[PDB]
Design an enzyme around this catalytic site. Sequence first.
Site, PDB file in Angstrom:
ATOM      1  CE1 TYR A   2      -3.291   2.814   0.286  1.00  0.00           C
ATOM      2  CE2 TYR A   2      -3.808   2.068   2.518  1.00  0.00           C
ATOM      3  CZ  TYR A   2      -4.059   2.902   1.445  1.00  0.00           C
ATOM      4  OH  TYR A   2      -5.093   3.800   1.540  1.00  0.00           O
TER       5      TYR A   2
ATOM      6  CE  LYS B 229      -6.405   2.219  -1.859  1.00  0.00           C
ATOM      7  NZ  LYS B 229      -6.966   2.836  -0.623  1.00  0.00           N
TER       8      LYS B 229
END
EC number: 4.1.3.3
Lengths: 293, 294, 295, 296
Positions: free
Chosen positions: B135, B163
């Site tokens: 992330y 992400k």
Amino acid sequence: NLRGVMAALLTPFDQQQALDKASLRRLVQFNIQQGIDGLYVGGSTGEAFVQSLSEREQVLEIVAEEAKGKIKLIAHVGCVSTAESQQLAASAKRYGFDAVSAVTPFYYPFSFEEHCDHYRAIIDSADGLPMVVYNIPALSGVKLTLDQINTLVTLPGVGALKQTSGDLYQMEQIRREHPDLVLYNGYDEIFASGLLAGADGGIGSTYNIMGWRYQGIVKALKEGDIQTAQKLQTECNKVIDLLIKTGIFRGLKTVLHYMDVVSVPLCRKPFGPVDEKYLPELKALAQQLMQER
Amino acid sequence: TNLRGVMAALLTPFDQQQALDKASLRRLVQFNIQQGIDGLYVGGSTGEAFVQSLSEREQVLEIVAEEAKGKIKLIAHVGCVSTAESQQLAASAKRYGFDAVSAVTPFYYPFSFEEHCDHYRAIIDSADGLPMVVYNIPALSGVKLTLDQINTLVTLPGVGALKQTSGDLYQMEQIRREHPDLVLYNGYDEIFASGLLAGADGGIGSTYNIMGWRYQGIVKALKEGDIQTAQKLQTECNKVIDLLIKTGIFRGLKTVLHYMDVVSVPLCRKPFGPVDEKYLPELKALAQQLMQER
Amino acid sequence: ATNLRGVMAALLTPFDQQQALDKASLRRLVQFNIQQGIDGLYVGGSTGEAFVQSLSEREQVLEIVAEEAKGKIKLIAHVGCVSTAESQQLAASAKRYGFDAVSAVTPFYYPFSFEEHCDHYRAIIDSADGLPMVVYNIPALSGVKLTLDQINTLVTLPGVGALKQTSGDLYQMEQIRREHPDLVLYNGYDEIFASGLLAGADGGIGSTYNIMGWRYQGIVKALKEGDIQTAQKLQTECNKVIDLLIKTGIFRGLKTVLHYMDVVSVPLCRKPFGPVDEKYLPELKALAQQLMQER
Amino acid sequence: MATNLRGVMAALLTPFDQQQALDKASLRRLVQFNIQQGIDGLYVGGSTGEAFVQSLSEREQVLEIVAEEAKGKIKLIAHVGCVSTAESQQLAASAKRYGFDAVSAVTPFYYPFSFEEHCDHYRAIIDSADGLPMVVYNIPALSGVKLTLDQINTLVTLPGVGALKQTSGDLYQMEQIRREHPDLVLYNGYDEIFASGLLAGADGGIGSTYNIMGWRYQGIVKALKEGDIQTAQKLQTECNKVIDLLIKTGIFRGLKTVLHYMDVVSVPLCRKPFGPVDEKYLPELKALAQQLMQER
């Protein structure tokens, strides 16, 4: 109509760093031959900030002699000084340019009101030529808010905005607020995504060597061919990756030199020469691009 | 199958006393499923995880699993500044049957890249088989990674996705070019269309909770080569995002969901404040519009 | 003293091989600081690795430090968390344990409005039940960039009695002092301590005070007596150490030095913090020797 | 003394007339005004002289006039920096011709140059300075060029470099630079932290506000030298009250306005895009001029 794909013109120099007129003319014709919509002259790419006012005027005049009436011509007349910018704007009018442009004055911190008056003054001296506001925070250090950008683009006499920002949320917001605004995507490496977000054209340095690819992306998107649009952008980015490593302007000049357009691929000091370790790739790229189209 | 798709970043409904509102949580999970969402990203920023204790985060994970395991994809964000705490949540996500785990780069303290790598390795070990979703969210974490560092993280043993909450679409394209098979989620809702064009093959976002079908519509439009449709949908999503940024994103979304009869009490946990009453009319009208649209 | 002005060490949290609190070492470190002549301790902040500790673990440290130093030196409890409720819990504990004041870093990660930051401090002050609040400004780690006007508003909130200023902007340091003549103002960056005092700070809180607090006390004294040269020489020596600690990793480097001073049993920090690079041990051991001889 | 560059030197302003052209009479008056308040020297053609909104010939004209007025009386440093290396070289040669004591150059800006390019830029200008020591100029806030300590160390050790103007509020770095280069002439760049900068390691300073109250900064140097911390702090505080005001009014134009009231500058205008001073600030600026004249 100022909408379109226009190349940010490079300024060829000789071994002694002086303007190479013959190569300048050759580069202008080269761009016209590959089907470019117009030329953005005297901006970052033209190495204008390492040139005197008279040198910038000399370039504007030569380009006009070579392309006026054939393709659109935008003269970037921006300087930190308002008076200097005005002088260039008046000259651009005399030479027959279709529009003028100015980067937000830099180095010294100026208030937004000062930026606004700066543009108004230049617009006055442009005597009829529409203004293309130039937003490029990465180089200028000037970070404008959406509200401020809206105010600048709505100033009387402003007909376009060159948006050299990777913020595609703001690109969309600008398009939303100004449906008819000519909005040029400034970062070649996100051209496809920039157009999808709201830009209706672009101005870029790499257009000098592969402008047809960008024209291809415009067409691909217009036809709904996302696959082709992505492939073209990917190939453009493989090239941009290289140019960022080699130094953008000198890399482009080196490719143009191998294409026999530019006599000497040097940029003015403090820009240094290209590291010889990159010549194999630059030569191969020139060969590839010449065969391609 | 795989982890590609449009995943909503789940919100955590609270009651008047700032305590988990289990009933509203369950309603929100089912509400998302009914919108046609491909899955849920649980325990991230949007779930107000950083103002929750480990026990509270685990409770949310367990409940969401009860409601959606087997119906849609479930990604558990187990990231904490602490590696040990992140590992505890990783072990719990495995226990509850989640499809994958995820962790934001540890923040506040400045950590070396080697320390960030070992952090992900330790969590992957505790995830016991579940793939890791790296992330990258520099705006909130304060951690600025280079492309080389990102490439290293996404190729670590056990990592299966990234992400990408970054507005840099040149980097989005570079990542796709370097990793053709990588699951790549666009993180900023406001550039979803452009993110997919640049290389993302899906997305994770907070606003999917109230209009996930619009994002699914953008994916479909781009797949069918319908540029205008994709643009129009993105423009509509951005009109909503403009409003939500003004009102406050999490509380604005909860307030809309409240008018949709999903969330009982639209409050966020302190220090987050309440929604300025002057925005209620717009949020209510938005809720009405969305319901009539869907 | 009947005030909070002074030189306070930001306390480290000693752990064992299992990364669990090493109570014996914690107690030793507290006593070590008292022996150095420190004015007080700032507990549960960045340096105590509080953000990789649970609420209950942070509370355990507060209780122990109180048992060891209450009534001997000033004690400031950093109770700050992103969550207001969690910060309030620690504030209540600090009050129960008899701390002299509480402190809280501006809540981070999520972007909060200035009004939300203000309410955050008000809520914690309420739970502190009378203990004064030390606002903690540290933009480098928190990511929160306050304006001078916002800082002025925070330091004047009812119940606020000090500001820990971890900022290298000494123009702002002077402006704060000019606006608040009586405010207790702690210099936060050890590496500019002397200049910070000159700019307006009237004390300081720092991580390196744990191994050489007497040097900082020496700087305060030197400036008070108008001995600029001595102040500069001391600051220079402190910076030579700081240069090293930044290369080795500050918290682990400090713990390692303390280990060689026979204070900390296991000089480990909690993951994601890694171990010290063995190549630095010689310098760290030599530094410990030098500091001990210097005493 | 003959070759020493250490000291308190004012960053000279460039007075213009109503038409935005150089006001020679006021330029001469400003040079003499600075000499009279005991300044150690002048830094000419820098940010404060509005050099970046001036042409090369205009910058040379200012350099030549200042030399005629102050050469031999006080130290003179010519900031010859331009983005272009060739333009910088032209100014460097002129500075030597006019008899300046040293040259200086801001790190070239706008375009992202590599560290190697910055180094070659300085080497080239140093060559054209033909003997005059170079004063490296680090000012990230305006140039956008962020150098690491190692890079600054490399720059200040280049052959021909005799000083560094450090316009940075990072006093840890200020101390590190002093520690690495014990003999380096180090100028504090931000007036508002002068006292703290000297304490950290700077041995002098260059600043815009020195034009109207240079004696205060000399007072701080003396105070710290005598170990009078209270006096040093008091002076710095008074300087900061003024700086607070100038930041609100606009630094260069605020200074020119004060100088106009002190009967030094005929017309206090800066060149466009700089706008005029907001009239709401005139009361404080006039009162400041009165106070400073009373003080001096």
